[PDB]
């Protein structure tokens, strides 16, 4: 029925504890469709739910894609893997389009604060990036442009209105960096973006609050994990403190 | 879709951890009516193990939340109704498996090892029904599980080696059935200890490269024995 948003959130937390993320996503989708601005808690429940729904397809897509490449010497096995991948892609695009619709219809146009604006624009960039991961041929370029345009708009807002220690500004830099490295095949810009975001958070560490401490320090390590991974083939100088 | 294509897509779904797809593929193979190979048999069981295991895990999480929700009638009802929703999915899965066992797998089982596999499976999925049963229907569900386990137990005791992973796995689950469903811990321990002792008497067989599965089940059997027997004056163990 048309239930209260607190009732739906309660059901979403029940589904989250049971690791039933379809249910959790359906509850938070209904919360979004009521048209009221999401609280930080509801926003995070929505994001986590669809993170898990789409992630199951992305991990399965990579497994099947790898098998398709490993079986390229046999036509029957390769075609079976290809057709299974195409089924998974259809599920993947339907999920991404579902999230992208909720962003366009409810979340982005109703975002009244820069923090939430950046959150939803980063989400838009992420789910277009997930579409880019499985886009083939000539239709990839348009999807990549959509991802970049949302990331860059979120980056402009974030650079002007958010501290470098804010988890959303850090998470934006992390994923935008991955976009440059893996979608645009631009490792220099990807490393520059990751290194700058980390360094700026370190430089202004005194702006980090307790409520953002665990999230921000986690994402700062994710930034360094990627930099260390990418600045391989020589380099990755160890760090001291004197 | 031909038989061999279905099995190949089932293996594909297994690697992708898409167990609903895997179960659907092996159910279609089963419904073709021919006897399953040992590989196809294992694919079918692993598929439905994961499909039903997700509901059982979620059932226990939601049941616990529901039981801990005192003085919040609305929240407790919401938790119960969500558990009941999970229960319905769980029953449909078990009924699906039990129907496949009764219509195809058990009647077509040509040799003892297969008969024991499928009869153990029938005992297992009736046991899963018993875990969420109550009222009047539980007694009948429990009897169905015990009768399937018992026949598998008599066939395996007759025609299978004590080191066979199917016979060991039967002893593991039948003993748990006794401990947990029938509240017969001494029967449960004796069943588990006899199977463990009879297999450890052929320890050289268990060390062979082909007996990794029996080796795993032997760890579980002894784990339950340690859990159920002793555990009072035990001191922690080290190894220099
Ligand atoms: C019940 C609510 C749940 C679903 C658990 O919230 C998830 C998490 O929600 C918050 O954390 C957010 C957040 C995450 C944190 C980095 C988790 O950090 C930990 C474990 O310490 C991961 C999540 O996916 C989430 C919600 C998302 C993002 C992501 C948003 O892009 C659009 C990039 C930034 C990051 C932000 C929003 C984090 O603030 C919280 O601050 C976290 O609490 C902790 C651990 O401090 C909580 O684990
Ligand atoms: C990887 C998965 C696939 C390919 C589907 O096979 C699952 C597994 O299938 C076989 O193992 C069976 C088997 C299991 C073994 C205990 C797994 O052992 C190891 C070392 O991983 C667990 C499975 O669920 C399965 C198929 C089921 C049963 C169970 C059936 O009850 C009705 C009773 C005991 C056990 C038997 C049938 C085992 O022989 C094999 O012997 C295993 O191979 C090894 C190396 O142990 C393989 O991992």
Residue numbers in the entry:
A (entry chain B): -1 to 240
B (entry chain A): 1 to 240
From the reporting publication:
14-3-3 proteins recognize protein partners phosphorylated at serine or threonine in certain sequence motifs in all eukaryotic organisms. 14-3-3 proteins have a highly conserved dimeric all-helical structure. Each monomer can bind one phosphopeptide via its amphipathic groove. Here we study the structural basis and druggability of 14-3-3 binding to E6 oncoproteins of four tumorigenic HPV types by a combination of crystallography, binding assays, and mutagenesis.
Nevertheless, the effect of FSC on interaction of longer motif III phosphopeptides with 14-3-3 is less characterized. We performed FP experiments to measure equilibrium binding affinity constants of complexes between the four HPV E6 phosphopeptides and 14-3-3 isoforms ζ and γ, in the presence of FSC. The addition of FSC consistently decreased by 1.5- to 2-fold the affinities of all eight interactions (ΔΔGav = –1.3 ± 0.5 and –1.8 ± 0.4 kJ/mol for ζ and γ, respectively) without altering the apparent preferences of the different peptides. Next, we used a soaking approach to crystallize the ternary 14-3-3ζ/18E6 PBM/FSC complex and solved its structure at 1.85 Å resolution. Also, FSC binding reoriented the C-terminal carboxyl group and caused local destabilization of the very C-terminal residues of the phosphopeptide, increasing their temperature factors and dispersing the local electron density. As a result of FSC binding, the water network around the phospho-PBM C-terminus significantly changed. Nevertheless, the simultaneous binding of FSC and E6 PBM in the amphipathic groove of 14-3-3 indicates that such ternary complex can be used as a starting point to design both stabilizers and inhibitors of 14-3-3/E6 interactions. We also showed that the FSC molecule, a well-known modulator of 14-3-3 interactions, moderately destabilizes E6 binding to 14-3-3. This indicated that the hrm-HPV E6/14-3-3 complexes are in principle druggable.
